[PDB]
Symmetry: C2
Subunit: 244 residues, 2 copies
């Protein structure tokens, strides 16, 4: 199997409790620079920073943003690996100062890697690809994480951009209601008020150029060489226009 | 997550296995009535037979056809579950006599359940959905097991029928090459000779009606109300026609 999945298995809980603690803060403001995250990873990790970052991406996508808590129900190998990560990278929780690493900051700084992992880790996420397919056929797995907004090129023609973000907002809507039970009984407009802000921030950040971002979107199958969105993105976008 | 995945996790090896041997003999002749298999499941399993069958499908798809061997590297919880299955169902390996159960026969006799499970278990299989997507985009997950042949309605219009079996044959070509690596360097038609006869036997067997099979194919999204294959089936059939 793909090594992303091998890692997901190493880090799975023996059973499921206070799971909601792991995800509830996902759209809470984060004050950091992606460049600084990468510097800190290299500084603490040496040449193995990339291998270690991969483990942290699996943790962020499949278990949450609280490394110490997620160790509690892990296998012995799992716990050991996570404890070594915490100690090497000095991992924190929540929204620490700007020179600290968290699992979510790592996932977000390596957005290109994170989103490519979503193709393999689809059935391990809070909202699965199968669940998204019920809302729109062939939903793009590369969109199934908040860090995807950092892959969006804002210089795409306006109609192509709006489709990409609309398609992605379909997953954000679902994900938001799952991770935050306070939003389950709410309208799309009220839920969108909670995820549009950090979304638009990453869309317009200076981390990863327009050109590089668009290369990722083309490599992910989400746009063609003209920037025109795939039929699956188009179907997702319209599904979001009339979503409840 | 979906319960099929929770089961796959419970049954996962702590490390990889001589793993090839779990999967060899997949296309080896099988002398069983699927009706007899179901009779034996009901006799040994009683009212919980379907719940136990679910577990055995997960083992057959993700771990192989040798129950004693696959336990060796499982968790204590997994091992205990598989032990209780061996003793309750009297599970055998290889191609035993007609009144014996194996994990492969269970999967095949419950083809309709097995093929639906592939949607969730794609990334656990010896050939993953992501690998198939490399060969033809949006490759149908429901086709990704030899037991799919028992879901094919032979009364489909010849053209539609050929598209469904050509689409499914794209998977079998890949799968045969994973279980016998020597077939990687053999021509497509040489590899097809190793899988076509058992495929055709299942297509033409008397188990599950033309009508019920076509309903499954419609429920699986592989054909429409009139038997016409989906766009992704048609692309996979064409890919098989050009495949190495």
């Amino acid at each position: 199997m793909d090594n992303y999945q091998e890692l997901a298995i190493q880090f799975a809980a023996q059973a499921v409790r206070n799971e909601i603690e792991q995800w509830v803060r996902e759209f809470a403001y984060q004050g950091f620079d992606a460049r600084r995250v990468i510097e800190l990873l290299k500084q603490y990790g040496g040449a193995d920073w990339e291998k270690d970052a991969k483990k942290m991406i699996v943790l962020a996508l499949t278990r949450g943003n609280k490394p110490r808590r997620m160790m509690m129900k892990m296998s012995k190998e799992g716990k050991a690996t996570v404890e070594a990560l915490i100690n090497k990278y000095k991992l924190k929780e929540g929204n620490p100062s700007r020179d600290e690493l968290t699992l979510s900051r790592v996932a977000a700084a390596l957005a290109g890697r994170t989103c490519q992992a979503l193709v393999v880790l689809s059935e391990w996420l809070p909202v699965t690809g199968t669940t998204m397919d019920g809302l729109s056929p062939a939903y793009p797995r590369h969109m199934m994480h908040p860090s995807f907004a950092g892959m969006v090129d804002p210089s795409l023609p306006g109609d192509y951009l709006r489709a990409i973000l609309d398609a992605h907002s379909l997953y954000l809507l679902q994900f938001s209601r799952v991770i935050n039970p306070n939003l389950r009984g709410r309208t799309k407009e009220e839920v969108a008020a909670t995820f549009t802000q950090p979304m638009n921030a990453a869309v317009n950040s200076n981390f990863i150029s327009h050109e590089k971002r668009r290369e990722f979107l083309k490599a992910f199958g989400l746009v063609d060489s003209n920037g025109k969105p795939s039929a699956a993105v188009m179907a997702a976008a319209q599904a979001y226009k009339t979503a409840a």
